[PDB]
Amino acid sequence: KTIIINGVQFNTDEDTTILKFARDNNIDISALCFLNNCNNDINKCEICTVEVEGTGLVTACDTLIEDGMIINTNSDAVNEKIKSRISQLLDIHEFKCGPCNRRENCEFLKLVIKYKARASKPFLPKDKTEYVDERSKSLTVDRTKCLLCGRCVNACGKNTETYAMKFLNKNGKTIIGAEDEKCFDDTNCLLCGQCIIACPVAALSEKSHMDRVKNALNAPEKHVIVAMAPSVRASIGELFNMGFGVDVTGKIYTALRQLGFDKIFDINFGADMTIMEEATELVQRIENNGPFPMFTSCCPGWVRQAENYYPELLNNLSSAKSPQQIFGTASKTYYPSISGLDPKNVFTVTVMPCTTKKFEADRPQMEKDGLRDIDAVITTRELAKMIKDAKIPFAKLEDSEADPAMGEYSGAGAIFGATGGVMEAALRSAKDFAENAELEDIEYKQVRGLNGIKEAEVEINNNKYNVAVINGASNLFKFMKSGMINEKQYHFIEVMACHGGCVNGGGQPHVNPKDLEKVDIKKVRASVLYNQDEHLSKRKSHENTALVKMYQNYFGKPGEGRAHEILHFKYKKSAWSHPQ
Ligand code: 402
Ligand code: SF4
Ligand code: SF4
Ligand code: SF4
Ligand code: SF4
Ligand code: FES
Ligand SMILES: [Cl-]
Ligand SMILES: [Cl-]
Ligand SMILES: [Mg+2]
Ligand SMILES: [Mg+2]
């Protein structure tokens, strides 16, 4: 194939699009609706317009290169077309970046600047309430910003296969939203937030908990605990121009103290408690020859997927609470017992890479004696904004430590945030538990990485067991619908709704599509966690000294008695009824 682009000749055997070939050869072509290898088929943005001699204007993102093509990417006709499309988008866009939560990393703003585009008539809605949906516990929609690019719809389809995000006809007007314009929570939506991650603008956002947090911090009698997820320390530095794959654990602890939090703990401590309980439950099932398989229960997007599509599996979920909720439960029971705090005055905040965790924390029954396990959940993005609003020089902060009593963590907890991390961590303990041993070989590399469905055979007390790691909600559907769950007897299955694990959660920093082709974000974020595991002295959850003290002095033996009564949560399918 001989191709000429802007007067430059190329000879290639590639079968690809103009857009992909140009970018591979360092020729600039803009794009908007193209992402995840698809564009908006029914309302093409045409920001990728180029001129093909003899054909006319074409969309580079979905036109294959062909021998004999002469292409111009930067002619007057091309730039006029692109400018006109951006101007038409501005006609339906509330262009007020000052107070906008994407002001610092908005893809639309970059295009507006690049093409010097302007609205024909500014869009200045007086009553935004009709454009905004804040009913959800996890997601919010601001349609004054929506470009109808379809990236959320395509991303939902690709990442979850639920198609919970849809194009809708709202009284003759095209919008995106949930089925029948319902609250997302009331549909089959997983609340995973992958649609947010795909959005180029501030149209999709997380449900804010920042007022909950600030009110608690400012309340004189509230003792505000904060604890961050495994993935936050591998990610948040991106929002302070520190690059990708930077471990910023110690700076986070310092920043949270400067924000006024009263105690600095860590969800990785909760990850070690989840393993304590779940590895014990696994050994119990092994000893009772069932029931099998046991599924993890720590990802609430997967729990929603089971509730909404596979309710027959709810009884197979581990009853261990997730790290967030198990930590929260202990923060209202154990922590008062070692601090003197009145439990009613403890206010527990988590920082998580996840929108779904807000829904999980707000589940009616996630409480005891009138005290919520978790009172507020802020995303990685929300914490970044609080740090910047406080004018805290994050990149320059010195490292501090967490408060140890609920802040120490093992290497097993540290890797929870990557796909296969829970599996690996759980096996390190279940194997020791079952064989009553302190095994030296603890690295389960077979369950790691970005393969969508991963299986391994493991030997526990000279018996072979089958495990699987399901990496992304679409892969859960593939595993079940294809009958793979029936090709062998599985005994323990990890499921995460977000491909890559929580490092790719719906509350994480947005990454520019061009940056995404330069950096493998899922692997680079995950690398921070595996590195911590490698360099930590304790690499099994049951070797966490602060956790052992907790169980010895307060909860007793895991998996039974007090621990089971307090630290577990069972999901139940609805009983048969007619009509459905
Ligand atoms: N609860 C909890 Fe988890 C832990 O520990 C997080 O905090 Fe995850 C992360 N990072 C998130 O969100 S949830 C699913 N299990 C894997 S990791
Ligand atoms: S979405 Fe982007 S272009 Fe629109 S107001 Fe916010 S920052 Fe500005
Ligand atoms: S939250 Fe997840 S399941 Fe729901 S619409 Fe967004 S991508 Fe789809
Ligand atoms: S919500 Fe965001 S991703 Fe979805 S169509 Fe609107 S601008 Fe595009
Ligand atoms: S994989 Fe992690 S970030 Fe994604 S929905 Fe599950 S818990 Fe949340
Ligand atoms: S980027 Fe090609 S049509 Fe939208
Ligand atoms: Cl509930
Ligand atoms: Cl402490
Ligand atoms: Mg297409
Ligand atoms: Mg205070």
For the chain, which residues make up each domain, given as ranges?
A: 2-90, 125-207, 211-567
Rounded to the nearest angstrom, the distance between the alpha carbon of 512 and the centre of ligand 4 is: 15
DSSP state of 405: G
In the block, which residue shows the tokens 């111009």? 72
Taking the C-alpha atoms of residue 456 and residue 464, their distance in angstroms, rounded to an integer, is 10
Determine whether 242 is exposed, middle or buried from the number of CB atoms within 10 Å of its CB (0-12, 13-18, 19+): middle
Atom of ligand 5 nearest to the CA of 505: 3
| CB contact set of 270 (below 8 Å; sequence gap of 6+) | 227, 322, 323, 324, 326, 327, 328, 330, 413
Could you list the residues known to form a binding site for [2Fe-2S] cluster, using ranges. 33, 45, 48, 61
Give the neighbor-by-neighbor strand order of the sheet with 49-52: 8-11, 2-5, 70-72, 49-52, 56-59
Q: Are 494 and 468 in contact (CB under 8 A)?
A: yes
- Cα dihedral 227, 229, 231, 234, rounded to 10, equals 10
Token pair belonging to 35 = 């992402």
Q: Are 55 and 130 in contact (CB under 8 A)?
A: no
Taking the C-alpha atoms of residue 139 and residue 24, their distance in angstroms, rounded to an integer, is 36
Beta bridge mates, 352: 379
In this structure, are strands 223-228 and 346-352 parallel, antiparallel, or unpaired? parallel
Token pair belonging to 84 = 């006109």
Q: Are 282 and 294 in contact (CB under 8 A)?
A: yes
Taking the C-alpha atoms of residue 379 and residue 422, their distance in angstroms, rounded to an integer, is 21
Solving technique: X-ray
Token pair belonging to 440 = 């030296």
Q: What 3-state DSSP class applies to 459?
A: strand
Q: What 3-state DSSP class applies to 31?
A: coil
Beta strands in 480-531 (DSSP E): 492-496
Q: Residue 496: name the closest of 534, 460, 533, 454 by CA.
A: 454
Q: What CATH code is assigned to 211-567?
A: 3.40.50.1780
Distance spanning both ends of the chain, measured CA to CA? 58
Angle subtended at Cα 101 by Cα 199 and Cα 418, rounded to the nearest 5 degrees: 60
CA distances from 253 to 264, 492, 530 (A): 7, 34, 20
Q: Which ligand is nearest to the CA of 570?
A: 7
Atom of ligand 3 nearest to the CA of 138: 1
Could you list the residues known to form a binding site, using ranges. 33, 45, 48, 61, 93, 97, 100, 106, 146, 149, 152, 156, 189, 192, 195, 199, 299, 354, 498, 502
Token pair belonging to 471 = 């990496």
Q: What CATH code is assigned to 2-90?
A: 3.10.20.740
Token pair belonging to 140 = 């919010």
- Fold agreement (125-207, 211-567): no
CA distances from 191 to 160, 179, 184, 384 (A): 11, 14, 7, 21
Rounded to the nearest angstrom, the distance between the alpha carbon of 117 and the centre of ligand 3 is: 32
Question: Of the residues 197, 268, 269, 352, which should be mutated to test ligand 1's pocket, given the most ligand atoms within 8 Å of the CB?
Answer: 352
Could you count the other beta carbons within 10 Å of the beta carbon of residue 190?
32
Q: Are 309 and 456 in contact (CB under 8 A)?
A: no
Taking the C-alpha atoms of residue 363 and residue 373, their distance in angstroms, rounded to an integer, is 10
Token pair belonging to 231 = 């993935």
Element (H, E) at 272: helix 267-287
Token pair belonging to 506 = 């719906």
Rounded to the nearest angstrom, the distance between the alpha carbon of 398 and the centre of ligand 8 is: 20
Determine whether 204 is exposed, middle or buried from the number of CB atoms within 10 Å of its CB (0-12, 13-18, 19+): buried
Rg (CA), the chain: 25
Taking the C-alpha atoms of residue 443 and residue 501, their distance in angstroms, rounded to an integer, is 18
Determine whether 400 is exposed, middle or buried from the number of CB atoms within 10 Å of its CB (0-12, 13-18, 19+): middle
Q: Answer yes or no: is the C-beta of 32 below 6 A from any ligand 2 atom.
A: no
Q: Answer yes or no: is the C-beta of 93 below 6 A from any ligand 2 atom.
A: yes
CATH 1.10.10.60: does it fit domain 125-207?
no
Q: Answer yes or no: is the C-beta of 237 below 6 A from any ligand 1 atom.
A: no
Beta strands in 135-222 (DSSP E): 139-142, 166-170, 173-177, 204-206
Asked whether the CA dihedral 403, 210, 341, 262 is positive or negative, the reply is positive
